[PDB]
Design a protein around this ligand. Structure first.
Ligand SMILES: Nc1nc2c(ncn2[C@@H]2O[C@H](COP(=O)(O)OP(=O)(O)NP(=O)(O)O)[C@@H](O)[C@H]2O)c(=O)[nH]1
Ligand SMILES: [Mg+2]
Lengths: 16, 205, 128, 994
C-alpha cells in the first residue's frame, strides 16, 4: 500500500 | 429589565479598564484607582430583548475601599477579578468571595483572570481551581486584546434571564443624516489630530 | 393527511474590510479606540446613498454610522502608513448625530490604500 | 443640602440619613454619586460609631442599619482595646440584644436576612476580642437559648458557622499566631457541646431552614474537627440518606460528604473502612432513586439549566472524583462492591460528556489519575475495561486544538488509554474516520478534532502496527479530500493530512520516498493563495525537519546528494510566493538541517549556499547605501535591509555556535550600518522633533537597529568559542552602541541596547572587566535619570536597566568598586528605588541585587571599602526594607523583603561588621552593634508607628533578632507585626509564640 499511498499524495491538489 | 452587578477584586486587576472597554470601546492605559464605587449602566441587545446591567465598579485598594461590603447589598450578580500576572491577586480571590457571598448568598458569580495578553503569565491555568467548589464560572479574559471580554456578561445574562440559548444580536442600524461658521475649528481639531500619533502602532489592527 | 409539528437588508455591501476605529479626544490630547470589527460600505438600493456601518466584534454594537459625504477628506496620520484621519459631522453610532474626528486603521498599507479608493468611489455615488 | 449629616456638632438627623442612603442605593446619576461621596465621609468619620446605636434603634432603613454595623465593625476590629471598658460592654450587650429582638419578629427574621447576617458577623468580631476570657459562658447560653425559638436556634447556627470561619479558615493572616491559636484551642475545648446541639437538630427535624443552616455550619466544622465526631456517631448515616433525599438539603449535604472524603482517618481500622464504603453506597443509591438514573443524559440536563441542576452536577462531579481518587481501592477487591464502583464511574462518564470546559477539566483530572493507576498497578485494568472503552470515545470527540494545557492533559490520558488497549483505540478512530467519509458526522470541526486525536497517540503503538495504522489513515484522508468539492473544504482536509503526517516522524524516518513526497507537496502548497495553507505548509515543514533532520543531512540510498542541497538549490523558486516571516521560518528550518552536518568544511559550505541570496542582497545595499546614505530613507530599502537581518537571525537561532562564519561575513559592515542608521534617526528627531520617533520612516530605521542587536545577542548567547567573542566581537560592538545610546535624547534610546549588554556580560562578563566599566559609564546614570522621576515612564528601560545591574553585580562586581563615591551612592539609590515598584519584574530584581550586593560586600572581609559601606548604607538598606514591608503596597515581595532583612540583621548578631555602625558621640564607647541596632530600630518604628507602645516594639525586636537564623519563624514574626500595626493595643506577649 506504500507505493500506492505515495502516488495518491502526489496527486493531491486543491483546485479540482 | 435591570440587574445590579458588583465588580470586585484587588487594586490594579483591571476592573475599571474592563468596564470602560464595554462602555465606550476605549482601552485606558493609565491606572487611576477607583474611589469607593463607580456606577455605570451597561445595555446589551439579545434575541430576548435588551438587558441592562447597573455595574458597581468597586475599589480594590484598601485605602479607597469606601463602604466596602456595603456596595454588595441587593446585588443580583457579580464578577470577581484577578490578574494572571500577579499571584497575590489570585491568593486574595477567596477573601473577595467570602465578603461577597456573606451579603449575597445565592447569585451567579463569574471569576475572571484578566491580562492574559501578557507573555509572562504567573498564575498558570492548572492552578486556577477555586471556582470548582464555589460553583463559579471562570474565564480567561484580557481587556487589552478583547479575548473573551463578552463571555462574563453573556453567561450572567443567560442565568438572569433563565434562557441558556440567549445570544447577543446586532442592533438595528438607522439611516444616518446628511455651516461655514464651524469649518474654522473643524480644521483646527483635524490638524491637531493628524499630528498626534495613533497609539499601539505595532498592533495587528 | 398528517399535520406536521437588523435594518440592513434593503442595502447592498460595496466594500468590507477589518479595521480599528478611533476618535480624537480634543480636550485630552489623546486618541481613543471606539471599536474593532468589520467596516462596511452600504449603498441603499432605494436611494443609492452610501454610508459607513461598522460593528464591534462579539457584542455587535455599532461604532460608526454616517454617510460618506463628498465634503470629507482622508488625511494621513503622522505615525501610520495604514490609517486615515478625517472629520465627520453627523455620526449616529451612539444616539443623535454628533461631529467626530475619526481615525481608522487597517491590517496593512494595501488595505488602507484600497479603503481610500473605495471611500472616494462612494463619494461620487453620493454626489449624483 | 445632603451634606447635612456630615456635621457632628448637631444631632444626627435619622430621617435625613435614610434619604441619603436610599438615594445612593435606589437612585442614579449625579444624585446617587453625590450621596455616595457623603456616605463614605459619614462612615470614615472617626466618631460615627457613637451614633450607631441611634441608627440601629431609630432608623427605618435596613441599609442604614447595615452601614452602621459596618462602622461598628471598623471600631471593633481596630480600636476595641482603646475604648473605655464600659462602652465595650454597652456595644456588646446592645448587639446581642438587637439580634434577640430581630429573631422573635418573624417579619424581621424572614425579610431582613442581610441585616441579621451582618449583625451575626459583628457579634463574631466581638467574640474574637472578648471570648472566652471575658465571656466564658457564651457557648452554654447560646446552646440554652437555642431551646427557646426555632428562629434563634437557626440564627445561632449562622453565628457558629461564621465563628468557625474566622477562627480556622480566615485567621492565618488576619490575626497573630498567638491569638489564632488561642481561639482555635477555645473552640476545640467547647466543641463537644456544639456538636451535641448540631446533631440533635439534624435528627429531630423539622424546619428545612433550620436544617440547612445546621448543615452549612457542619460544612465548616469538617475542616478541622477530629475524625471521631464523624465515624463514631450516626451522622454519616443521616447525611448519606435522610438529607440526600430533600433537594433543600441535597446541595449542602453533598459538599459535607465531599469534605468527609478528605478527613484525616486511620487507614488500618476495618470499621472506618466499611463506614467509608457505606456512606458512598447510600449516597449513590439516593442519587439513582431520587435524582437521576445512571443512564440519564447529563449533557442534555446541564444544557437545559433548569433550577440548580448545573450546580448539582458540578457538586456531584466534585464528590465522585474526590471520593474515588482517595478510596476507590476499598471498592475494587470485594465482589459485592463491583456494581457500586462501576456505577460511580459510569456517572463520571456521563458527567464527562457535558459541554462545560471547566467541569470537563475537573473530570479529566480524575481520569488522568485513574488511567495512570491502571497503567502502573498490577491486576487493576481488567476491572475498568468497559469504563475505559467509553472514555476513549469521550476524549476523542472532545479533543481540543494542540488551550495549551487542556490538550496536553487530553493527550496524556489518551496515550495511557491506548497502551491499556491498543486494539480498541485503533478501532474507534477508523470507525470515526468512516463516519466522516460516509458524511454522517462530516464537519470541519469534526474532521479537525479527529485528526488531533489520531495525531496525539503517536509513538504509543508498535512501529509495525503504527505503520499499518498510518497508511490506513492517510489513505482514507486522501480519499476524503478527493471526494469533497471546493477548496474551502479541500484545504481543511489537506491541512489535517499534513498535521497527521507531521505527528508521525518515526513513520516518516523509515520511508524516505514517502518523506520526500510530503516535503515536495508542502512546497507546492507554499504557492497556494488560499489563506492558511502557506502558513500550514511552513509550520509542517519546520516541524518535520526538527524530528527528521538527519534524513536531510545524509545522502539517501538511490539519491545523488543529501536532500538539503536540493532544498537550498531551489530555495528562491520555493519561497517566491511566501510572506517575509514565512521565508524566515523556511531559512530557520534549513539551519536546523545544516547543524546536523558535523564535518566543518561541509557545514560551512551549506551555510554559504543557504545564505547566498541574502548575502547578495546585503552586499548590494552595503555598497550602494554607503555610496551614499540617501537610500536609507527609501521605505523599500529599509524593509529589504530589515528582512536581510531577520533571515540572519532566523538561521542563527537554529545554528547557534555554527553560525559564526556567516556572522563574520557581515559583522563589520553590519555595525557600520548600525552607525549610519543611528545618524539618520538622530537627524530626523532634530528636523521634526520627538514626534519623528512615531513616524513609519523612523520606526523602520529603529527596526534595523533592533534586529542587528537581536542577531548579535542570539549568537553571543549560544557561542562556544568565547575567546573570539571577546577578541573579535565585543570591542567593535561597544564602540557602535554605547556612545550612540548615551548621546541620544531619552525618547530615541533603544532599551534593546541594555538587553544586548546584559547578554554580553552574562556570557563573557568575567573576561571583559574594562568592558563592563565602559558599559556602566555609558548607560547607568543617563538611564537612571530616565526612570527615577516616577514609576510609569519608559517601562522597558526600567526592566532592562535592573536586569543589566543584576548581571553586572553577579559577574563583574569590580565595576562597582571603580565607581566614584557619588556614582556608587546613585547605585544604592537605584536599588532602593526598585524596592518601591509594584512592577514585579523591577521589584524582584531590586531585592535580589540588594541581597547579592550585601554578599559581595561580605566576601571582601575587613577592608576600608566594606567598613565604609556598612557605615554609609547598612541602615539605609535596613530602613528601606522595613518601609516596603510595612506600607501594605508591596505585599507581593514579602518573602524576599523578609530574606533581605534577616541577612541584614544576622550580619550584626554574628559580628561580621567589624566597624561600629554609630558615630563616636551618639553612643557610649564599646557598645556592641547589637545594642545600637536595637536602639536604632526601636526609634525608627516608634516614629513610623507612633500608636505602638514601647513594649510592643521591644518584644517584636527581641523576637525578630533572636530568630534571624530561621526564616519560617522570622516570617511569622513579621506577619504578626503587620497585623498589630493595623490596630491599637496589640498584645506584646504575642511575639513569644515561637
Ligand atoms: N496588558 C494589560 N493591561 C491591562 C489589562 N486590563 C487592564 N490593564 C492595565 O492594568 C492597570 C489597572 O487598570 P484598572 O482598570 O484601573 O484596575 P482596577 O482593578 O480597576 N484598580 P482599582 O481596584 O484600584 O480601582 C491599567 O494600567 C490597565 O492598562 C489587560 O487586559 N492587559
Ligand atoms: Mg479602578
Amino acid at each position: 500500500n506504500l507505493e500506492a499511498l505515495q502516488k495518491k499524495l502526489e496527486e493531491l491538489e486543491l483546485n479540482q | 429589565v435591570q440587574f445590579k452587578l458588583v465588580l470586585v477584586g484587588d487594586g490594579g486587576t483591571g476592573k475599571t479598564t474592563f468596564v470602560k472597554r464595554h462602555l465606550t470601546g476605549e482601552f485606558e492605559k493609565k491606572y487611576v484607582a477607583t474611589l469607593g464605587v463607580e456606577v455605570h449602566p451597561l445595555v446589551f441587545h439579545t434575541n430576548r430583548g435588551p438587558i441592562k446591567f447597573n455595574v458597581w465598579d468597586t475599589a480594590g485598594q484598601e485605602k479607597f475601599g469606601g463602604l466596602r461590603d456595603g456596595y454588595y447589598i441587593q446585588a443580583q450578580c457579580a464578577i470577581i477579578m484577578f490578574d494572571v500576572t500577579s499571584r497575590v491577586t489570585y491568593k486574595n480571590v477567596p477573601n473577595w468571595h467570602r465578603d461577597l457571598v456573606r451579603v449575597c448568598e445565592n447569585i451567579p458569580i463569574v471569576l475572571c483572570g484578566n491580562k492574559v495578553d501578557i507573555k509572562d503569565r504567573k498564575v498558570k491555568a492548572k492552578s486556577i481551581v477555586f471556582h470548582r467548589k464555589k460553583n463559579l464560572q471562570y474565564y480567561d479574559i484580557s481587556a487589552k486584546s478583547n479575548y473573551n471580554f463578552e463571555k462574563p456578561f453573556l453567561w450572567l445574562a443567560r442565568k438572569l434571564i433563565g434562557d441558556p440559548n440567549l445570544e447577543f444580536v446586532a442592533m438595528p442600524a438607522l439611516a444616518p443624516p446628511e455651516d461655514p461658521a464651524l469649518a474654522a475649528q473643524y480644521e483646527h481639531d483635524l490638524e491637531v489630530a493628524q499630528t498626534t500619533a495613533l497609539p499601539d502602532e505595532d498592533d495587528d489592527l | 393527511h398528517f399535520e406536521p409539528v437588523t435594518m440592513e437588508e434593503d442595502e447592498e455591501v460595496l466594500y468590507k474590510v477589518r479595521a480599528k476605529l478611533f476618535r480624537f479626544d480634543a480636550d485630552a490630547k489623546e486618541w481613543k479606540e471606539r471599536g474593532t470589527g468589520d467596516c462596511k460600505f452600504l449603498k441603499n438600493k432605494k436611494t443609492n446613498k452610501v454610508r459607513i456601518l461598522m460593528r464591534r466584534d462579539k457584542t455587535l454594537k455599532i461604532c460608526a454610522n454616517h454617510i460618506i459625504a463628498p465634503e470629507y477628506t482622508l488625511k494621513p496620520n503622522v505615525g501610520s502608513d495604514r490609517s486615515w484621519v478625517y472629520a465627520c459631522t453627523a455620526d449616529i453610532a451612539e444616539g443623535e448625530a454628533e461631529a467626530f474626528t475619526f481615525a481608522i486603521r487597517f491590517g496593512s498599507k494595501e488595505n488602507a490604500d484600497k479603503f481610500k479608493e473605495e471611500f472616494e468611489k462612494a463619494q461620487e455615488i453620493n454626489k449624483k | 443640602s445632603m451634606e447635612g449629616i456630615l456635621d457632628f456638632s448637631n444631632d444626627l438627623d435619622i430621617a435625613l440619613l435614610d434619604q441619603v442612603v436610599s438615594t445612593f442605593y435606589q437612585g442614579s446619576g449625579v444624585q446617587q454619586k453625590q450621596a455616595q461621596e457623603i456616605l463614605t465621609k459619614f462612615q470614615d468619620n472617626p466618631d460615627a460609631w457613637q451614633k450607631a446605636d441611634q441608627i440601629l434603634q431609630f432608623s427605618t432603613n435596613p441599609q442604614s442599619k447595615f452601614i452602621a454595623l459596618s462602622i461598628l465593625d471598623k471600631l471593633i476590629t481596630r480600636k476595641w482595646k482603646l475604648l473605655p471598658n464600659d462602652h465595650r460592654i454597652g456595644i456588646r450587650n446592645f448587639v446581642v440584644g438587637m439580634i434577640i429582638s430581630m429573631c422573635q419578629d418573624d417579619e424581621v427574621f424572614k425579610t431582613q436576612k442581610n441585616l441579621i447576617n451582618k449583625s451575626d458577623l459583628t457579634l463574631v468580631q466581638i467574640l474574637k476580642q472578648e471570648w472566652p476570657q471575658n465571656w466564658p459562658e457564651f457557648i452554654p447560653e447560646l446552646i440554652g437559648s437555642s431551646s427557646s425559638s426555632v428562629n434563634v436556634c437557626e440564627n445561632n447556627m449562622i453565628v457558629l458557622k461564621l465563628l468557625s470561619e474566622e477562627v480556622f479558615d480566615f485567621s492565618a493572616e488576619q490575626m497573630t499566631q498567638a491569638k489564632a491559636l488561642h481561639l482555635k484551642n477555645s473552640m476545640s475545648k467547647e466543641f463537644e457541646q456544639i456538636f451535641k446541639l448540631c446533631f440533635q437538630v439534624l435528627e429531630q427535624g423539622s424546619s428545612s431552614s433550620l436544617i440547612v443552616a445546621t448543615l452549612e455550619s457542619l460544612l465548616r466544622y469538617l475542616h478541622w474537627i477530629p475524625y471521631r465526631y464523624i465515624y463514631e456517631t450516626n451522622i454519616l448515616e443521616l447525611l448519606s440518606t435522610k438529607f440526600m433525599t430533600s433537594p433543600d438539603t441535597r446541595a449542602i449535604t453533598l459538599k459535607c460528604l465531599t469534605e468527609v472524603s478528605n478527613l484525616k482517618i486511620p487507614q488500618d481500622n476495618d470499621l472506618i473502612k466499611r463506614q467509608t464504603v457505606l456512606f458512598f453506597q447510600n449516597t449513590l443509591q439516593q442519587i439513582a432513586t431520587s435524582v437521576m438514573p445512571v443512564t440519564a443524559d447529563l449533557k442534555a440536563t446541564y444544557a437545559n439549566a433548569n433550577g440548580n441542576d448545573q450546580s448539582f452536577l458540578q457538586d456531584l462531579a466534585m464528590f465522585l472524583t474526590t471520593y474515588l481518587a482517595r478510596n476507590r481501592a476499598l471498592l475494587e477487591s470485594d465482589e459485592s462492591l463491583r456494581e457500586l464502583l462501576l456505577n460511580a464511574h459510569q456517572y463520571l462518564i456521563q458527567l464527562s460528556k457535558i459541554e462545560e470546559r471547566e467541569l470537563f477539566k475537573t473530570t479529566l483530572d480524575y481520569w488522568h489519575n485513574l488511567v495512570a493507576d491502571l497503567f502502573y498497578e498490577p491486576l487493576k485494568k481488567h476491572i475498568y475495561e468497559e469504563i475505559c472503552s467509553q472514555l476513549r470515545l469521550v476524549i476523542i470527540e472532545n479533543m481540543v486544538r494542540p488551550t495549551i494545557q487542556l490538550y496536553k492533559s487530553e493527550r496524556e490520558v489518551l496515550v495511557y488509554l491506548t497502551h491499556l488497549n491498543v486494539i480498541d483505540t485503533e478501532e474507534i478512530m477508523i470507525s470515526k474516520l468512516a463516519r466522516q467519509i460516509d458524511g454522517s458526522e462530516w464537519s470541519w470541526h469534526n474532521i479537525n478534532t479527529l485528526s488531533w486525536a489520531i495525531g496525539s497517540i503517536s509513538g504509543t503503538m508498535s512501529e509495525d502496527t503504527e505503520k499499518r495504522f498510518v497508511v490506513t489513515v492517510i489513505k482514507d484522508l486522501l480519499g476524503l479530500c478527493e471526494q469533497k468539492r471546493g477548496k474551502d473544504n479541500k484545504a481543511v482536509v489537506a491541512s489535517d493530512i499534513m498535521y497527521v503526517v507531521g505527528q508521525y516522524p518515526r513513520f516518516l524516518k523509515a520511508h524516505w520516498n514517502f518523506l520526500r513526497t510530503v516535503i515536495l507537496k508542502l512546497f507546492e502548497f507554499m504557492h497556494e493563495t488560499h489563506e492558511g495553507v502557506q502558513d500550514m505548509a511552513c509550520d509542517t515543514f519546520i516541524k518535520i525537519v526538527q524530528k527528521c533532520k538527519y534524513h536531510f543531512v545524509i545522502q539517501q540510498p538511490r539519491e545523488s546528494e543529501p536532500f538539503i542541497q536540493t532544498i537550498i538549490r531551489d530555495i528562491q523558486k520555493t519561497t517566491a510566493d511566501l510572506q517575509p516571516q514565512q521565508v524566515h521560518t523556511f531559512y530557520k528550518a534549513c539551519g536546523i538541517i545544516i547543524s546536523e552536518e558535523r564535518s566543518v568544511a561541509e557545514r560551512n559550505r551549506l551555510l554559504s549556499d543557504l545564505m547566498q541570496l541574502p548575502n547578495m542582497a546585503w552586499d548590494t545595499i552595503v555598497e550602494q547605501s554607503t555610496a551614499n546614505p540617501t537610500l536609507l530613507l527609501d521605505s523599500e530599502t529599509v524593509k529589504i535591509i530589515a528582512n536581510i537581518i531577520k533571515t540572519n537571525v532566523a538561521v542563527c537561532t537554529s545554528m547557534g555556535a555554527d553560525f559564526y562564519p556567516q556572522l563574520g561575513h557581515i559583522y563589520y559592515n553590519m555595525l557600520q550600518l548600525y552607525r549610519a542608521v543611528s545618524s539618520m534617526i538622530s537627524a530626523q528627531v532634530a528636523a521634526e522633533g520627538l514626534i519623528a520617533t512615531k513616524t513609519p520612516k523612523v520606526r523602520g530605521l529603529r527596526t534595523i537597529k533592533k534586529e542587528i542587536l537581536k542577531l548579535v545577542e542570539t549568537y553571543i548567547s549560544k557561542a562556544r568559542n568565547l575567546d573570539d567573542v571577546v577578541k573579535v566581537l565585543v570591542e567593535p560592538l561597544l564602540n557602535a552602541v554605547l556612545e550612540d545610546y548615551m548621546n541620544n535624547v531619552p525618547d530615541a534610546r533603544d532599551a534593546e541596547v541594555l538587553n544586548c549588554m546584559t547578554t554580553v556580560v552574562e556570557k563573557v562578563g568575567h573576561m571583559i572587566p574594562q568592558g563592563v566599566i565602559l558599559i556602566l559609564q555609558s548607560v547607568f546614570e543617563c538611564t537612571l535619570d530616565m526612570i527615577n522621576k516616577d514609576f510609569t515612564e519608559y517601562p522597558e528601560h526600567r526592566v532592562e536597566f535592573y536586569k543589566l545591574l543584576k548581571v553586572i553585580n553577579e559577574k563583574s562586581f569590580a565595576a562597582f568598586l571603580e565607581l566614584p563615591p557619588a556614582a556608587f551612592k546613585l547605585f544604592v539609590d537605584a536599588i532602593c528605588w526598585a524596592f518601591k515598584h509594584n512592577n514585579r519584574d523591577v521589584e524582584v530584581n531590586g531585592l535580589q541585587i540588594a541581597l547579592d550586593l550585601v554578599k559581595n560586600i561580605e566576601r571582601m572581609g575587613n577592608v576600608p571599602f566594606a567598613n565604609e559601606f556598612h557605615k554609609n548604607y547598612f541602615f539605609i538598606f535596613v530602613s528601606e526594607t522595613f518601609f516596603v514591608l510595612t506600607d501594605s503596597d508591596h505585599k507581593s515581595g514579602f518573602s524576599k523583603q523578609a530574606l533581605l532583612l534577616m541577612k541584614l540583621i544576622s550580619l550584626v548578631y554574628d559580628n561580621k561588621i567589624s566597624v561600629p555602625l554609630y558615630q563616636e558621640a551618639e553612643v557610649p564607647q564599646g557598645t556592641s552593634n547589637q545594642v545600637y541596632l536595637s536602639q536604632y530600630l526601636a526609634n525608627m518604628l516608634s516614629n513610623a508607628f507612633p500608636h505602638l507602645t514601647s513594649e510592643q516594639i521591644a518584644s517584636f525586636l527581641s523576637a525578630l533578632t533572636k530568630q534571624c537564623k530561621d526564616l519560617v519563624v522570622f516570617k511569622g514574626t513579621l506577619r504578626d507585626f503587620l497585623v498589630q500595626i493595623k490596630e491599637v493595643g496589640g498584645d506584646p506577649t504575642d511575639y513569644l509564640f515561637a
